[model samples]
Target: DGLIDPAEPLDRGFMHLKGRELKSLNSISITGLNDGEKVILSTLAGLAARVTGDQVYINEGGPSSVWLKQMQNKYGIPVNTYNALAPLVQHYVETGVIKGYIVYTPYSEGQSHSINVATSLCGLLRGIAVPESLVDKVKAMGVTTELMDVRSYDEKWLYENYKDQLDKSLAADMKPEIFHHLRDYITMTNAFAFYDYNARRDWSWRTSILKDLDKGAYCFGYYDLDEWGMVNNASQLGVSMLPTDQAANLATLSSIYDTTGLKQRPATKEVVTEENVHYVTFLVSDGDNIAFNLWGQQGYMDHDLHGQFPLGYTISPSLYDLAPAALRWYYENSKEGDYFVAGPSGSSYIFPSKMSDADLDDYLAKLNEYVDKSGLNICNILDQKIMDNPKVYNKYLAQPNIDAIFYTGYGEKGDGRIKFSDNGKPVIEQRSVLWEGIDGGSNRGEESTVISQINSRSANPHSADGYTFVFVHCWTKNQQSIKTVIDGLNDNVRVVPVDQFVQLVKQNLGPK
Candidate 1:
């Protein structure tokens, strides 16, 4: 129930180790280094800690460092003053804790592509990463490094070096452009990536690379499954691509489990509904994004407007892996009306439609397991290609543990409708537009516009038997914005927690 299975595949076995015994622990400040160097050093530190079992942790900045403090307070561990990266690297190397180093060029554009390669290889090779500038220092410390010169040799040559060493259970199909933000995560999980933005336009190069990567691997990155035969090529070959969604602090956060004695309550309410008054609830999107939760969630959590009304905040059950401390805090500090639900299917983000039937079945089994542990009953599904696919919709229904599902995306399979699963669980869709006023990545509109959209959902085809479901984009609109819309609601509009709304809809719709 505490630490995740150490032998689990997909390089995720290292998710939770907070409950493990820790005789020696230290904290170092990487705040003084530049972004690139800091991330690289931190990623290296995370790898060392994971491999060696929580010997060192890094403090990146303000709110991000809270988890470190929490660990010290909870475990009674002291933070020793080792402020530089060189000494730390020397220590790891001198003790024979880490084998060697993967040296990448300092350049950012094409050369930085090696950073992912270095991270992917580091996990498998029991090594750390450093730029070529630090190779002499690494050598002086009696550590050897394999230089990743992406300029002269493309990814094909690079893949040849470490393809055999890769854990084919999982792979990261991420953008090299955001290497700094994603390095910590990719390194900690030990997944390899041969992904670049160029693949978006031309899959010519990526297709062969994907095929060579071993079929049936789950690809975690920002590749849109709806675009350019991505799902067709990858899924057809047994490769399922899912969104990584700016995963950051994965290495540091996952290791620090929360010791706070706060239990997460299931998001459920009485199935009470009015015949005339329209029902609506805002199911906030993208809580699965680890970076946003680390950097941006504090604003939502601390805002004074939360308890004034109900909100269904979506979060990944994988937080048990990615950020245990933060996951605990989210559950502990949640307000009365704040309902925390599973975001983006389960464990990790995957477009279920893109997964082959066998892969999908295995994935759902894992999802149910985590759902049981995390105590999230409702599943918020984000599928872009499920336009009118009954087969894809039925796949979710087969899951035994998921009680209710709040689905969204650019699809019309069950658009603005609530359908019951065999067991009376509600599988509902949002009544609003997919983009602009609804999607956070697009224009969610001003307060008045938001209120107007909510009002529009209360009428005609949008409302199903006086119940209107609205999944609000929380990325742009804050507590205050939400409060404004709630205040502006007409007499006929009533806001409730998503669970209660779902139950009421289930009752209204009657039996399957």
Candidate 2:
């Protein structure tokens, strides 16, 4: 005979043993039960009664275990503490206590618990653990649920099944515009780190992402040096416009030309030898767009040189003429042949000689006009306020074409040198006129002092761009610091996604 009823002896022994084990493991007296235990006892008793196919147990809401045992003795049907509620309900339905129209309400704080119960019922039904009648009742309720069984589906399977859905949800369910903006920020951040890591290692050169400007796989190189490298090495190149203050780096970079002896070749020479070489041109502009373009181009070029082959070179016209003029000159004079011209749409800087306060108004006007004519999009304007002068900032912001302004600060410690206003506003000031722009700002102190400043403010802020995209170029470490600063800004200023930015570059510039 099966041990279906508590009176069967086997069932009784198992119950007692399980109870004793629970008591011993929990280190609690089970003589008198609490609400939690009462609930557990009720559920177990119902389970036992169902297994026995008997109504041997009775639940009067007090001492569930004892009451259930007594009910089992009185009922000729084996006490089904297991089907406690289910069998009772089935009996009631048969005996007319519960009419076909009668609806039983289950009490729960939220739908989550109800859903969990529904899922449990489904699992039990699938295993035929409960009576078929009860299973039919549960199914009739139209309860749809899912069971999470680690044995059935592992983490890898779940990821593969849901990654696309998650990505779509992120792009559509969230804020698409904001998400893409942040995506771009992230891409730039990652690109910066990628380039910096390789540059520091002397393993690759800088490249650009603006190859996408033409919505194609090709890009143009700007400076003579880059043109020289590409032509001699058979690499592609682009034109980069930089500010005059930053020109010193170019002068320093000229050494690469000397080392490669690339500049010795005449423009008429088509053949690339160790002696005759090609160079890429870098033009100077007082715009963050120019910097962004240069950085992006450098990334692209680096990818090509290291990741691709043929080592083509790029060339650009002299810096004296307008950007278009430079492109035309390169097309006519360069030996590597003509390619597309690249420049910046937003965020430009001003060199003391090329772009001064004397020419600030005109410079902005020309830039704005160029943007209008080129059907280009303007994003941000970064003004390097090296001096404590708000006048420079005010002058730039006064332009209708300029959307947002970014000011760079300096410090003595490794801490960031920049300081926000008392009310968390951007700090602005007016100081010496000579050291007014890039050379002025908070970094005017000493190199060590500036480093300390960079360090102190390194992790000060904890939000993304509050007003607009605040581009802070620091000499500290890498993209990590830049990301920290952007995160310090408010969330509204999307940090730009890193993957999308990289993908965009790769798509435009090829595998590199």
Candidate 3:
């Protein structure tokens, strides 16, 4: 039963091009080739012309000559001669003299040394056809031609070294948490200032009842005081008034005086110079252990504020110095159920400040009694040397529980004169403090200039351990303006966003 089926001839036509050609020749007047095969044969003939450098055209814009040139350059083979015989090749392929042509591998110079030469060659034909307009658009978007090229040793070296460094630096320096908090603070402060300014402009003296608070100062004025006299004589002179803390003020002043090594022997006098122009002034004088005032007519007298306010200065004491005493007070007062002293003694204070001072003190005393019973504060258990050292103080300030610290003046100049570290770098080298004017005018002219000078000297943008911190005073704008300025800053600069929180948080905790 192995008889040939009639359908076998139909199957042969679909099975092979040669079989189909044979069947077609027998059935139709279309001779040896179909339209598709003829077109393919013609294209091959045009390609053959590429080797001979002959102008044998097929599609008007096809890359016949360009491919020939590329092949000659890459392979060291003369295909130009093939173009002279293109017509014969075309005729032969159509007549079935040859089935197909074979192209030999090009002899590429330096290809052995190149890793991606083969891959690059495969992509080159496509790249050559890309329009110039698209190329320019890519360039405008910062794409380089080298990105599409093979990986050279120079590029590989850059990716290995420079790219690695960039990634590491971005990971280390681009702190999203810091950015978020800073952005929040700047936004809030700007909004508050803008509202305050608007209120002053619209309501005048009526705005004094708003009761604005910053730091320990409770302000009720159209705007923050620009002059020392305005701040000092606010209530008495019938100008708007802001009530500020006296003890904290004194503490900040004392710290400034001690750190700067002001030459005044007593170091506690309103008038230290005969010219009545002492760099610093003392508010409360007992001749010894006098308390410096932060809120005198002038601002703090340390290098941080020496040139900020024309008639006043700001007083700042090291957060390291104040935090311990404040903690001690908090520990002595919080309730037994409170979680302020949840960790080891020197770790963190987490108690809410809603409890009364008496209630907190009772808790502190109870804690003290428990520690005494356990003999925890004994000389053997707690080292005395650590208590007296400033290094320990600095360390405590940086602890997560400790939150933050503030210092009045910057450290002295010299190789190692100043003593401390900021963000893992020596604070002595990065000693300057910064101050920005409130209204951007003559309100705080002299002090502002001094602050600018200090900023120039200590804040080296290129170096990591340069300026320690920046503080802005007399802020009078809203959140929008502050955000605008902060967002506009380059990576080299940073702005402190929390102006109001610095004071608010401290106030909530009560006196140290």
Candidate 4:
């Protein structure tokens, strides 16, 4: 039914499923998906259940002769091996008896399973957002809850409330099948996920999830690409961001650029389908469970305007920019254009040093002063206070509407990317970001390693389409510190240095 339970957090997001309903969070134990072979089989079963709204059966074996009649009472699910079992599977999906099941086929723990799962979920959800009553009890949990659209991010908060209803639905409800509607844009709604239960063999649930959805239709899976016809099924996508020599296989590595669009198929689609597949990885032609795959195409949407879609900036301050005046930059800067300031109240003022690095701090202070006193008239630079968990930016770049995010920071990884310590020692720790082609580079030029770093981190969260990123580190190897706005870059975005941005404003409006 289209009438979603009125109890669901309507503002957040919930979708439709056929099952009746069940329990809440802080609880566990489902026999299907534990470890070993059951891992994958259970994974498929879960996704299948949410999609089909029925139980899932795991079949061991039987012959084509007449196993259905013989084992009907024993197996709970129909049976057969090879083509024999295929019939039983079809019967379950059609009858709503069981969501789907698996067997001891040569393809178990195989990409073929991935192929089946992704394609099965595709196009099945055409944004209908049917109704159900799965979330009546979740909100009553004595905790004030808030939510954001899937992958939706702005400077103030990179991702929605980190893990709430999404996690809750998974917990109390068992699935995100509950529903209410926002009607803002079309997107694949709820998805059910399961990892291969087989612990002995590398379940590789995450990678399998990526591959399964490579087509990008936006149904579900671990949620994950790349390139040319080297492997049997290759395309324009690449395995990673680095340059590569031509290969003979079709399944070579691919970039997010290579992944499909929301309406299309495959892995990277997580961004558009509403799952926010950004920052998820684990792949490669390497099958030891340690290989890798990268998600890279930058996401973008068509706009009938004169320029790029969101053509503006969602800027933030470095965790170091603790200046009380930083928020003013956003307050007065909005008149310039679409601007969402990140942690504007007070972020790290990434100054290299106090005694030895006075020059850098002096410049940052002046910029801070300039912004505070600029009296710039604007209505766009806005935001939410990220006083807690500033790392939210790491997950929000998947939003399709946000075209660009700009930042000022330490030169290496730009915003919040810590490489050099305040004590002037190289901090040999790594960030949670997928620092592929962009990270660890200099902010040189048009081939702006800074720009690439910004974009890559933004895209790291999901399909980074046409979004744009402008990173200006006040200091770095050169030394600098800056801010957030993880939304990412599209061709439409324009991130400028603080001075440059001011200059652009002056140039455009001219002396009062």
List runs of model 3 lying over 4 Å from the truth.
Answer: 1-400, 409-465, 474-491, 494-512
- TM-score for each candidate, following the candidate numbering: 0.82, 0.22, 0.18, 0.22
Prediction 2 global C-alpha lDDT: 0.24
* Cand. 1 Cα-lDDT: 0.62
Give me candidate 3's TM-score against the actual structure: 0.18
Candidate 2 structure quality by residue, lDDT tens digits, 138-159: 3343212222222232222423
**lDDT at 8 for candidate 2?**
25
Please provide, for model 4 over 421-473, each residue's C-alpha lDDT reduced to its tens digit, 9 standing for 90 to 100: 12221111112222223344423422333335445543322223212233221
Give stretches of model 4 more than 4 Å off: 1-22, 29-101, 104-224, 227-512
In model 1, residue pairs whose N, Cα or C atoms come closer than 3 Å (at least 3 residues apart or on different chains), thus clashing, are 436-443
**lDDT digits (tens) for residues 84-169 of candidate 1:** 76677676666555667777654464455665666666656656666667667667766675534332343455577766655555
- For candidate 3, the per-residue lDDT at 504 reads 26
Indicate the TM-score of model 1.
0.82
**How does residue 364 of candidate 3 score in lDDT?**
37
Instruction: Give the higher-lDDT candidate: 1 or 3.
Output: 1
List model 3 lDDT by residue over 407-436, tens digit each.
Answer: 222111212122333433122211222223
Those runs of model 2 whose alpha carbons end farther than 4 Å from true positions after fitting are 1-358, 373-387, 409-512
Report the candidate with higher TM-score, 1 versus 3: 1
User: Which candidate ranks first by lDDT, i.e. highest?
Assistant: 1
